[PDB]
Amino acid sequence: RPSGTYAGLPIADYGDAPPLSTKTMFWRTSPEKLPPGAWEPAYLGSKDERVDGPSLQQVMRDQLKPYSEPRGLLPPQEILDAVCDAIENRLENTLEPQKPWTFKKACESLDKNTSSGYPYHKQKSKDWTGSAFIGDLGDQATHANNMYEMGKSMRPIYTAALKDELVKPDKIYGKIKKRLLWGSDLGTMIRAARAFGPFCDALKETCIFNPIRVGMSMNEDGPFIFARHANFRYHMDADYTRWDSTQQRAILKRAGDIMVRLSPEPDLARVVMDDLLAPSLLDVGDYKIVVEEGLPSGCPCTTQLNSLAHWILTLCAMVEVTRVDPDIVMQESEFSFYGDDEVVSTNLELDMVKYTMALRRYGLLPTRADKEEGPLERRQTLQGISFLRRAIVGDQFGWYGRLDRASIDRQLLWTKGPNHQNPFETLPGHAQRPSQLMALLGEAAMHGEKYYRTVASRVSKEAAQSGIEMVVPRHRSVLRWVRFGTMDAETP
Amino acid sequence: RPSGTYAGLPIADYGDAPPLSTKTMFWRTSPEKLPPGAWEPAYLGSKDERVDGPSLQQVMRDQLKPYSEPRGLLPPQEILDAVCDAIENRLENTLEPQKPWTFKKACESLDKNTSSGYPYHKQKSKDWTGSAFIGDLGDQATHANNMYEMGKSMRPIYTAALKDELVKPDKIYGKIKKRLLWGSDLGTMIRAARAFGPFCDALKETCIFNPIRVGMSMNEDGPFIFARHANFRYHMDADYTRWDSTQQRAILKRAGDIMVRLSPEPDLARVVMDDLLAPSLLDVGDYKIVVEEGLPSGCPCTTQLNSLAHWILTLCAMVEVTRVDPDIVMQESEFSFYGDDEVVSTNLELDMVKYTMALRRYGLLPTRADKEEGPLERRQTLQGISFLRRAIVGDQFGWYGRLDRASIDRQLLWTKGPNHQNPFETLPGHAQRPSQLMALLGEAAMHGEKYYRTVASRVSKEAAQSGIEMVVPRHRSVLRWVRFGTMDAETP
Numbered sequence A, B: 001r002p003s004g005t006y007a008g009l010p011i012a013d014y015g016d017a018p019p020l021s022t023k024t025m026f027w028r029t030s031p032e033k034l035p036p037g038a039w040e041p042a043y044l045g046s047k048d049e050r051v052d053g054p055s056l057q058q059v060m061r062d063q064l065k066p067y068s069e070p071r072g073l074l075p076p077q078e079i080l081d082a083v084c085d086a087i088e089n090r091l092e093n094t095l096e097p098q099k100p101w102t103f104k105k106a107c108e109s110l111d112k113n114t115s116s117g118y119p120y121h122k123q124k125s126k127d128w129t130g131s132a133f134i135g136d137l138g139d140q141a142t143h144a145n146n147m148y149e150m151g152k153s154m155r156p157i158y159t160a161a162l163k164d165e166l167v168k169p170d171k172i173y174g175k176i177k178k179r180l181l182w183g184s185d186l187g188t189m190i191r192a193a194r195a196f197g198p199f200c201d202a203l204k205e206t207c208i209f210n211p212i213r214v215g216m217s218m219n220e221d222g223p224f225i226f227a228r229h230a231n232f233r234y235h236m237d238a239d240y241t242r243w244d245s246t247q248q249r250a251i252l253k254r255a256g257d258i259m260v261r262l263s264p265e266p267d268l269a270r271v272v273m274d275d276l277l278a279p280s281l282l283d284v285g286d287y288k289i290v291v292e293e294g295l296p297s298g299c300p301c302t303t304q305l306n307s308l309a310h311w312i313l314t315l316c317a318m319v320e321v322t323r324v325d326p327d328i329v330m331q332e333s334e335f336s337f338y339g340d341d342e343v344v345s346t347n348l349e350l351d352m353v354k355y356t357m358a359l360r361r362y363g364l365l366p367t368r369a370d371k372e373e374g375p376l377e378r379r380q381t382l383q384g385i386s387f388l389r390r391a392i393v394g395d396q397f398g399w400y401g402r403l404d405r406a407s408i409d410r411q412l413l414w415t416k417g418p419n420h421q422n423p424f425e426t427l428p429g430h431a432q433r434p435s436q437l438m439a440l441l442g443e444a445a446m447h448g449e450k451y452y453r454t455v456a457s458r459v460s461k462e463a464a465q466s467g468i469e470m471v472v473p474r475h476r477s478v479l480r481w482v483r484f485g486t487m488d489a490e491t492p
């Protein structure tokens, strides 16, 4: 060890991962022919009756290419230092200090409905008493917790997967594409959660005052978040391609440094962060390969780290171009980050050619709305920019996030259910989606009378040829409940 | 009846009111000489050892003068109709429909620590079981509730008082002035609360989305409210003199019409509103006088009615001058109203001479910051405008309301306690003001290190020569707790 090459990367060891999933969670809501150009669940492999394409394995090899691509340049050192200082300083000024997380708390915080990853590849709930891990997962948890408390290092092992999600038809029938997922190992999950849960909680409570929006409620917080952004003259979205795979570990380490420094157990958190950022072992089935660069997006606290790296790079490009100090940029701007997702608003008069070039030089791949070459565009209205998959809309009552007509139509055409081979199958279960149907009514209401009425029809049929019968409210009642609703819970 | 004149108004009947209060609730926090030009509790009458002035009765007569002053002009009818429609329409779009208030609920909502007014003039708690009124107050409550349910009219009777509050020294030592209070009668309080409590609750839940800010939290809501205002180019405050006494009942009736129309029991609410707005009987001690014009500010739901009248008049003046429809003005503006208190923000290019003239023509008395003649000023920054007795301040974290240095100094010089004759007396009770002292620390923190340190000294002494001993936190800890504090309750 380590010798040999897979998908352009060094092989470190034999693989333990289970075969890639061959099934989808999405079921058609009806037997009718799907409208043309309609989204469908992502490609399912050699058994996919819709097309003859490559193996899931090959598809995965295609996803791994960007990770052997040469890295971009580091932003100038003085700028990088200055923005990191300003960011850490802003977080010191805003974050409520936290108590350390117990092993019990770290264990509780983990999603019990996903895999434990290496080495047991077992749904976490299978070994979960309701308050602790027993059996195989108990051994793994307890050992990792011990390593944590002794400040001892452990090599993380990630398990590769491909995301089951609705994609545009060309990704199925033209050039096939399915998105890479990093499945973290339980040990790592426990260590990361104990180390960084305090930081991430402090950050969530602060997701309106600070640009990292993880843990926000779109309906509850969106109005205030977007009103903040609207206080500034210029608005933009760089719309990055392949964000995760274009990351530099060096940038990620500076992001990690801030997280460590701002944790209640910095010395123990350092050991964990150092493990997270070291050349990553990724299990692709037959092999474990070494992934030296890009984001290892497996963990609990991965989204925060990534959003922090994003904050760094955005401030770097802006400071480099405007020549204004990072702290002053921050008093002339409002940012929203959520992993690769962003809105940047500023009063600063930004040279968009120079800004785009700076981003490209860092190895990032920003893209124009029209998908043609040239500089990123800026506008003087927020209307038309999106965030967390919602369009930002403003009227006489304020700002808010609204799901577009295409996405509402999509959720009406598909429903989540158990895993199965054929997406076009109907879920014969009568299919009770009551809470979901309600939210969908809410989204449609925000589009007007005409649109709401058509969705209300489809929602009725879908509840008619189903179990329960619920009242379908008037437009003006549900509109009032989504926009201003005294709280979220239950109907208008 | 009705014959004879008191304070320029018709006498309707003999008075039943108790003598005007001769005492203040404020006690000096120390025996040291007060700084020169320092605020003091308002004038206490013939027994006030600080000055020889007129009787409280005469002072009251001076307060009653504006109510016999001729009224201003009604805004043009087409405009008035259009703004009322647009206002009622905005409230229909935003307010969650409510269930009627029970007698039990109306009774519970009443402040039990103030007077029952006519005819018993007894603190409400004196007859309060903890869930119902018994004794004299029970008779009064029950009868009024019966009149309410039968849609029967009752003549309200108000009791005049003078506000015990800190005033600038000239109002004590120069031309004496003490502010008029209308003390409503229990019967009226119950009827008004049953009739309009539903409307006022609907409005409170909506105090961020709608311009009537009653029920807002400055710390919790201020940031969002002020961020909304900042979305607009021009900002102003008309800073009205004698708002309540310059009101037209005709304007108040249109305000009342909206409240009625938007209540769950409109026919019963109409009887109550019609009683509220009819020529008012005001008990000044020796007489009950008829007050035909101005605001009868006695009730529970008086502040909402007044804020609504304010909304009407502000929209009227703006529409009259800009020539833009009331609904479009509202999509180009953000207002905040709380009785006479206002902030108006707009993208509309408003002729400030014409706007000031329109307001003056309605009988209002707006005033310039510099207190000289001429037009109201507008600015392009919110910074420097106040609301709910707080300055509006914005930094890199957002907007917020901050109490000024003079007001912080004031609350350090005086403390509330039982009623007594001499303001300069020290409250010998050791004087535990723990919650208050904390908030004051919070306000000072928002002024910087230097100022916070001086206040921290004074707050320590005041806790030292007192009962309890509490930790006095660092500047950066308390600043973090006031601005962003995970919640309000307890310390940083």
Ligand SMILES: [Mn+3]
Residues within 6 Å of the ligand: A237, A239, A341, A342, A386, A387, A388
């Ligand atoms: Mn985006």
Ligand SMILES: [Mn+3]
Residues within 6 Å of the ligand: B237, B239, B341, B342, B386, B387, B388
């Ligand atoms: Mn004011």
